[PDB]
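Internal QA ticket QA-208
Title: Verify multi-chain structure generation after dependency bump
Assignee: T.L.

Test input:
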Amino acid sequence: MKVRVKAPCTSANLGVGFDVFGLCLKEPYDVIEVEAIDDKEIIIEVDDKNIPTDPDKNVAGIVAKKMIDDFNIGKGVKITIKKGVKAGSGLGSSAASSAGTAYAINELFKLNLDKLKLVDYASYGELASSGAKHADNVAPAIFGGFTMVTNYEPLEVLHIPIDFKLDILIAIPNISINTKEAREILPKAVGLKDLVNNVGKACGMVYALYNKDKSLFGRYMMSDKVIEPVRGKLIPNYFKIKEEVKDKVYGITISGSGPSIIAFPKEEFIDEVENILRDYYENTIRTEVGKGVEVV
Amino acid sequence: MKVRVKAPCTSANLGVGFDVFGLCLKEPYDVIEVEAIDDKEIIIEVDDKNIPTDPDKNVAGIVAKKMIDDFNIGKGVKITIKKGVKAGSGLGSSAASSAGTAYAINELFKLNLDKLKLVDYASYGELASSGAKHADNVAPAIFGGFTMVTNYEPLEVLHIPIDFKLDILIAIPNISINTKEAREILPKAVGLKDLVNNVGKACGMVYALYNKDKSLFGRYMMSDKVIEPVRGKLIPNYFKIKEEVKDKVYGITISGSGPSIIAFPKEEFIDEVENILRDYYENTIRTEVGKGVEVV
Ligand SMILES: Nc1ncnc2c1ncn2[C@@H]1O[C@H](COP(=O)(O)OP(=O)(O)NP(=O)(O)O)[C@@H](O)[C@H]1O
Ligand SMILES: Nc1ncnc2c1ncn2[C@@H]1O[C@H](COP(=O)(O)OP(=O)(O)NP(=O)(O)O)[C@@H](O)[C@H]1O
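Actual output:
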């Protein structure tokens, strides 16, 4: 019959966790409904005219087809998507559709797949714009909390639930950054010193989560000198914003490949940091860590 | 009057934790005694003729002088050292003397310094052969357990006690590897792909310790493709040994800059893995995680 879900936006990289770390947000999210239909075609409806309805281009259609073929399902599906945020925002918008679809198909056709397999299937949607199955946004979208994609072929995801309170502020510029281009501009090689720094700071962030230390987590998050300083130059007022909220947040950095900005405000300054972000970007959201795709 | 301590050998790097991770061993260790003397000179006695007695070259003398001057102590010290293992073995031999001395001076002159400051002082001994204050061996020697040096200037050390049982096997070749040379041969730059791999695998090792997962810890430890494959070529039979103990250990890798080899055998094959290591290197030791410098 049919299944409807809310599939969350996610923030990847988190500074020194480039291509590994993922943090699931509670908002924004896509609302996706999948209905089994007798005709074997896959029909897609989406409320954002800039997103393809062709089932071989829309990531939801790509993921559904792969799963339907893999299990010889024999039915088509009509997928209706209401977008939480536009693509190219650095918030895992496409991944929300890829993950939500994987989860919905799994429920609809009772495939009983585990979370890792759902992330693996969702990652095929993320391939439609990569040449490679990136899973750092679809992993948190499925698992909720904080995730680390620690291996590919085969995929490995380690999950750390966030049991404490972690306020999040997200500023969403109206401009977009194409992720392939965002990657082309990155250095092809990094110095041994940056390797040592990022490995240490990233490991420190993991220790910080197990020790519920927001200050440590946020400070190490801001120590990347390899990727963030390069991509931050694509974002108007990003460095000025970092300076203005300096002692009022545990940390602030680029969400995914940008241009969205993610900040972890200190309890005492949450309204003030939100207002500062709003001053620059009217589309600013207050949220927290999410629990992953779920039925709605 | 006088203070006598046992200062443990330590294993740094642990594969993807290059220049960050440190694991304290219970054995071998140096036995170091420090006695306050009226004359302000620093006298050093050491049972290894290949180690300098000049107080400005022996790391124990360098560390003691720095601490004595910093606190206007006004007394000299006579330091007697009985070495656990030779320098250039990849087991933090010099660091054991540096850390043991820092700890002993702190006790002898009642300086009440915390562990981090002791590691910082010990790291000045490690400077006598670096140009830089490396702390990845002195940190575990002082803290015990597993440590991560996550920042320099100022020094930051995160400590993770090892509460579970972790059997360790150490093979000590009779040859030495000069650490400065071991570093010169490393690549000056690494690919973005290796940065992603090592950050993810190193973070996975941290997660593995908090989840007491030896298999995960050991497997990720062996995923470094940047440093270990280069230095392993300096160690006779190292790759052959890895292949022979393959399914009998949680993991095996180079200790520090080598040539010593550190393995974490599975409970079922401990005698068999020790015998294999002994076949190649008569000086093989069975040990476990240590608790750091202590009085003896
Ligand atoms: N259901 C969908 N939702 C969003 N984008 C889609 C969808 N289906 C196909 N796409 C296309 O795929 C591309 C995904 O772009 P991308 O810039 O990576 O968005 P992103 O999914 O928002 N992730 P990121 O910016 O990395 O957080 C765009 O070209 C989209 O047109
Ligand atoms: N008390 C000491 N114990 C050991 N070496 C010392 C000591 N004092 C001075 N040294 C000298 O410092 C150098 C330290 O060499 P090194 O090869 O790094 O040993 P290592 O301390 O054994 N550490 P590593 O091999 O990195 O685990 C040698 O040249 C030694 O002669």
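Spot checks passed. The first helix of chain A runs from residue 59 to 70.
Status: verified.
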